[PDB]
Amino acid sequence: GAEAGITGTWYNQSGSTFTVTAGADGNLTGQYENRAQGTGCQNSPYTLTGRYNGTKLEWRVEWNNSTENCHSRTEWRGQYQGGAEARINTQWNLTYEGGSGPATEQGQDTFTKVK
């Protein structure tokens, strides 16, 4: 089914990569390696969990593992682009402990699939 188009390795404009397995059941499971300069929790793999349906994808990475804890998480909501160079256009929300309660940052990531 469609899951074939998603499963593999992707990268964004910041050099972050993720490896995902997309299940025919809609499940998204993988590992994310963050390389956005200046941000915490770079390099080491963090678990990705998400879902997809039609052209729409969403996934979550909680930025705590055995090597670094950034007291934050990011949720991406995206849409798939088809062939030649497959693409996922996303908007993300990063929720973190701000000092007087949770805070959120927003941004956009474009992922391109590794050939």
Ligand X SMILES: O=C(O)CCCC[C@@H]1SC[C@@H]2NC(=O)N[C@@H]21
Residues near Zn ion (CB under 5 A) are 1, 23-25, 27, 71
One residue of 16, 20, 30, 52 binding ligand X per CB under 6 A: 16
3-state secondary structure at position 17: strand
HSE-CB for 101 with a 13 A CA cutoff: 0
Convert residues 31-50 into a mask of x (bound to ligand X by CB under 6 A) and - (unbound): ---x-x--xxx---------
Judged by beta carbon distances under 5 to 8 A according to partner kind, the member of ligand X, Zn ion, none in contact with residue 31 is: none
One residue of 20, 22, 48, 70 binding ligand X per CB under 6 A: 70
Judged by beta carbon distances under 5 to 8 A according to partner kind, the member of ligand X, Zn ion, none in contact with residue 23 is: Zn ion
C-alpha 80/C-alpha 90 separation (Å) is: 9
What are the C-alpha distances in Å from 16 to residues 31, 38, 42, 106? 11, 13, 9, 17
